[PDB]
């Protein structure tokens with residue numbers, strides 16, 4: 001028992017982190033096979049970041065201007081290209097520590113682990129969700145650009161995020177490993193609207209099921225509701241509308257607890273309408289939405 | 305910016321996890337150099353765990369009865385001994401992945417990362433604190449015994465905890481790497497009182513400093529307090545008394561924010577007396593106490 005914001009073990013990703021320097025700028029790169037992936041803004045100077053013409057900026061750069069260092073050893077850059085907002089630096093050596101990997105674009109509401117890195121060296125690992133507004137509420141300081149988000153399926157690492165930017169609001173924006181930004185964000189030092197951030201309803205319900213499995217059952221009531229009645233309540237509280245696909249995904253959790261999804265919805269409705277009254281659920285005084293139904297089942301079944 | 309419950313990157317520890325089997329019991333072991341460390345209750349059967357005589361039980365066991373597997377390969381056991389509540393199984397092969405390490409007994413209120421493991425395979429990593437009542441609020445299922453807690457200082461791994469037991473209350477108890485239990489717990493399936501769990505005051509203050517650095521400043525007030533006046537309030541709310549050693553440790557955080565420790569104490573006093581009023585601090589609706597002053601400075605400075 002117990003419920004914690006658990007991240008995947010980070011070893012397979014630590015062995016991929018390198019430091020990339022271009023001109024005066026240093027950030028992190030991801031070395032997989034003979035390619036180092038990094039944010040393209042590594043080629044920018046502070047005077048360029050207001051409105052950079054990356055194509056023109058990249059033209060003034062040659063292979064030898066990209067310094068890639070893996071631990072203490074320098075990697076030889078034999079090719080460079082820009083794919084959307086990432087640079088791909090071809091090196092002459094395949095990373096011997098390259099795990100089995102995939103590049104995936106995650107859906108909003110899905111979770112992933114972030115290995116925060118500085119100067120190509122890992123500093124920490126934490127779990128987070130891609131928000132419905134395509135931002136992440138990470139923990140990143142200067143030099144963390146190029147740090148990646150990932151998921152692990154047994155031996156395969158699915159990389160889903162590369163850190164690029166911190167918005168003036170303190171939230172983070174970045175790309176998938178093909179360089180496509182999640183959300184409407186651009187790699188430009190300009191004011192950018194993140195958008196209204198709603199609560200991931202299917203995840204809150206999964207976490208309520210986790211609470212029931214863990215003995216926290218005070219919030220359970222004698223009521224039920226309908227998908228449409230529940231969604232009227234969810235709209236008022238900026239919660240994502242619950243669909244039958246969401247109810248289907250909560251099936252194993254509903255079966256394990258013997259609590260119908262709509263009965264749990266009625267408990268959530270009452271919690272939204274009445275608050276916690278100073279009580280806690282799984283050590284929290286607010287409704288947690290960064291655990292998917294898969295995460296709850298994983299943490300409650302022990303998949304390694 | 306951003307503040308997350310960050311764990312150390314787990315790679316150095318993942319390379320140390322092995323599976324230990326004895327009779328019908330399987331749990332995790334920690335392989336460092338030519339020694340595998342594991343909870344001694346691996347030698348027990350379910351009929352023995354009510355009141356086991358470990359010395360008598362261990363007598364019926366020989367080297368060949370301890371099955372140690374590192375990934376897919378079997379390790380040859382050439383020696384076995386009991387040190388307090390851990391067994392040390394000498395194997396004929398030094399772990400080639402042994403990092404620079406130390407065994408340390410942590411103080412209550414200190415934090416550490418846990419690499420939860422099953423069948424010698426890592427499943428997740430999370431950060432936690434040793435509670436003042438010497439329990440940990442972890443996330444562990446059947447088969448997680450032998451999973452370890454650690455800290456990383458650049459390249460050196462300081463192992464501080466080995467998981468042994470889940471109390472009937474859902475909290476966890478275990479030992480340091482010399483087999484000495486944290487707290488009064490015994491490795492016996494008997495009812496054991498955890499004791500009153502107080503709040504780590506120095507950690508809550510560190511987290512309030514983290515909040516101020518991150519822009520969350522609503523809780524700051526026009527008041528100050530004294531150590532004795534504050535401690536009267538801390539006693540009422542089951543908070544650890546704040547000492548001048550604690551004030552000294554908050555020095556760098558006080559200097560970075562320009563907020564005197566006693567002024568932050570007065571903010572904490574008002575938060576204890578008045579509650580949050582439905583507001584949040586660093587995305588939380590309760591006062592967080594599992595971040596030490598060192599953790600706050602580390603997460604706000606980027607030590608790799």
Ligand SMILES: O=C(c1cncc2ccccc12)N1CCN(c2cccc(Cl)c2)C(=O)C1
Pocket residue numbers: 039041049140141142143144145164165166167186187188189190305
């Ligand atoms: O290194 C960071 C950085 C990253 N993450 C969190 C931080 C918190 C405090 C200070 C700096 C950071 N930068 C530089 C690049 N940079 C940027 C600016 C404009 C566009 C692009 Cl693509 C990128 C940043 O936003 C900020």
Ligand SMILES: O=C(c1cncc2ccccc12)N1CCN(c2cccc(Cl)c2)C(=O)C1
Pocket residue numbers: 001343345353444445446447448449468469470471490491492493494
């Ligand atoms: O494997 C676990 C275990 C571990 N952690 C969390 C769990 C959550 C659900 C079910 C089982 C566990 N056990 C077996 C040993 N065991 C024990 C019983 C008495 C004494 C000793 Cl030292 C140990 C346990 O407490 C429980």
